[PDB]
Amino acid sequence: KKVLTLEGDLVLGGLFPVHQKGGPAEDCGPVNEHRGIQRLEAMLFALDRINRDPHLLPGVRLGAHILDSCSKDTHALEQALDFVRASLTAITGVIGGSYSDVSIQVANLLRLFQIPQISYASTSAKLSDKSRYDYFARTVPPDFFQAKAMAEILRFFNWTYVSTVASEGDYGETGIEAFELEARARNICVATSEKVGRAMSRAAFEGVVRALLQKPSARVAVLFTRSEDARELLAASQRLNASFTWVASDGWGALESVVAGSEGAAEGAITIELASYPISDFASYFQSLDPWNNSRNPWFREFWEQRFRCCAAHSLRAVPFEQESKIMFVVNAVYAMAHALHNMHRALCPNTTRLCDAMRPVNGRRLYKDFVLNVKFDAPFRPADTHNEVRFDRFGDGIGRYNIFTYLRAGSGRYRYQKVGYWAEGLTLDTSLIPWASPSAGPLPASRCSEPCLQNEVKSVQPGEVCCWLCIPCQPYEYRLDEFTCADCGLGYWPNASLTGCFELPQEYIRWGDAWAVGPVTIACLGALATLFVLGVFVRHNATPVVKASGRELCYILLGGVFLCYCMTFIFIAKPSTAVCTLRRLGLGTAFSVCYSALLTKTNRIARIFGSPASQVAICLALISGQLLIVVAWLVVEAPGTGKETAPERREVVTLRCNHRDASMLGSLAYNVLLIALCTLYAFKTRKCPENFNEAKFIGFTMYTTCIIWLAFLPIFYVTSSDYRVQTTTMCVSVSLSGSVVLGCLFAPKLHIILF
C-alpha cells in the first residue's frame, strides 16, 4: 500500500514488518511495534545519524525504501518484487526480515539482481547454504550456536550422559543436530534426544518428563525449545513432583515468564541468552519523538490506535517503548551497510563527496560479494557501548554474543534469574551463582557413566551403549597392558602390585618348623654325628698300617659309603646349586649302593669259601665306578639344574633340586641296590662266617633290617611324582638311615668292645 521512503541520493530498502498473522478476510494481521515501529525507526534513525556523521561520504544522503511488509513469506516476496522493479533510484541493499522465511524469500529474489541483504532472528536451520547465501547475512547470530554453548556448559560441569529435548519445529531440529555434533566432539553421550511443543499437549509434556525421570541416568534436561513449550515441560515437571537441572536456549530469554508459575521445576537451571547492549541515543531519540507533529513515519497512525486511548491529544512520549536487542541489531545493521557503502563510494566515486555515475547501476554488484561481508569496520557510526564491532566474519553470521544466567530460589520473592557468566568466544562462569555446582552446595547430579575402573579391572565392557565403559577384573596370570586389557606374563607370573608388571613365583627351601624338628633341616646335619667320627676310631684301631689303600680299603669302602651318605644329605639341604642335582645322581648313587653292594660282595666270598687284597679291592671299586660312569654320561648329556619350575598356577620352587623329572634317573640306581640287598639275603642261606666272631650273626641282623628299610622308601621315592616336599625326607632318611644301620651293626661289635 505505502513505502516509507526517506529522501536521499542513494537508497537502501528494508523490511520491518508492520503487520503480523492474518486470516480468510485479512491479507495480514494486526500491527506489532516489536516487529514494526521499534525497528522501522531504528533504521530511519540510523540513516539520518549516518547522513550527518562524516564516516558516511558527507555529500551523499542515504534514503530509504522500507517495504510495506507483514510477517508472511508470500507477502514479502510479492512486495520484494518492488525492489526489483526499482532496480529494473534503485536499491543498493535491503535490510530486514524478522523471520527466516521472510528473509529467505526476499533474498531468493534479490540475489539474482545482485542486491545484498541483512536479516534478523533468522537461523542456520535454513540459512546455511553459503554457495547462494554469501550474498547476505544475519545481524542476529543463528540459534545453533547456543546448542554448541550447551555442549560446552555440559562438558565444563563433566555432564557426559545427558537428555536432549528441543522444540517441534526447525529451531528444535537444528539445535539437536548442532548439539549432538558438538556434544560428541566433547565426549558427551546423549542419553535421550526428542522434540516437544505445545501441539502435543500436557499429557505428552508429562510423558517427556517421565521418559527421563523414570530413566534417571541423566538428570539434566537440555532444552533447545521456545518459551511456551519450555513452560509446559516445567509445569509437567512440577505436576510430577520432581525436577531436573535444565540447560536452556534463548527460548528461556533470561525470563521468569517461562518458569515461575512452576518455579520449583527449575532451581539452578542455566540459560544461554542472546546478549543485548543499549544505544542510549536511540532510546532517547525514539522515545522523545512525536510523529503527531513529526511527518517522518505515517505508519504510526495505525499503531497509535491501540497505543493511545484517542487522537492527537496523546503525544507519542506518553507511552513507552521496549528497548529490545532487536533495536540494537537493526541500528548496528544499518551502520554496517552504510560503512560498506562509504567504502564503496571511495571505490566507485574516489574523487568526490557526492555520487558518481559509477554507482548509478546498482553497486550491489560489488557490495554483496565483498564490501558488505567484510564489515566489522571497527565499530563505525558508534554502535552499542561495547564498540567492539558491528559483527565479525559475517559468513551468513551475526554478532555471536550470549550471556549466561541461572534460575535461583530467591524464596523471599520468586525464583529469579541472575548473571553467572557468558559464552560467545567460550564459556566463563561463576559456579557459586550456580547452586547446581556452587562450592560446598552443588550436587552435580548423575549424568555421567561409571567410567573409572578398579586398577585391577581391565576388560572392556560396552553394555549395549558404548557410552558407559565399564571394566572386568584381570585374570591373575596376566598383567595390565592397556586400559581395556591384560597381557599374559606366563602363568608362573601373576600380576604384581605394579599392575602393569608380574609377580614371579619365588624359589625357596626351608619350610620346616617346630613340628618338623625331625625334618631334613635337622636330619641332614645331625645324622652324620652317628658315623663320621668312626674313621678316627679306625685310625686308632688300624692294627695293620702297613697295608696300603690299594688293598687296605677292602674293609673300609663300606665306611666310606656310609660317610658319603651323610655328606651328600647335608649338601642337599645347604647348597642351592646344580651341585645338588649333580650329587643326587652321582654321589648319592654310590653312597647307598655301597651299603648293600659291599655286603653282597663279602657274602658271596663267604658263600664260596665256607661250605690277594689288591684285586679284591680293585674289584670292589670297579663295581662302584661302573655306576658312576653311567651317571657321568648322564650329567654330561643332560646337564643338572637348580630350580624345577612346574605347576605354575600355584607352585613355589626350591633352587636346590633337578629340573628334570627324576623318576628313573635316581630310580634305576635305587632299584639296582634293592636287588643287591635281596640277593644278599638269598646268598645268606650259607650261614657260616668266622672272623673274630661268627659274623653270620651280624650280617644277618644287618641285611634283614636294611632290606626292609631300603624297600620301605621305594613306594614313595619312585612313586609320588605329584609331590614336591616328601622326597626330601624320603631321600634324607632312606639313605642316612641305611648308613648308620650298617656300621652300627657290622663294625660296632668290635668297634665298641675295643672303644669300651
Ligand SMILES: N[C@](CC1c2ccccc2Oc2ccccc21)(C(=O)O)[C@@H]1C[C@@H]1C(=O)O
Ligand atoms: N524459528 C526461529 C524461532 C526463534 C526466533 C527468532 C526471532 C523471534 C522469535 C523466535 O522464537 C524462538 C524461541 C526459542 C529458540 C529460537 C527462536 C526463528 O525465527 O528463526 C528459530 C529456528 C529457532 C526455533 O524455531 O526455535
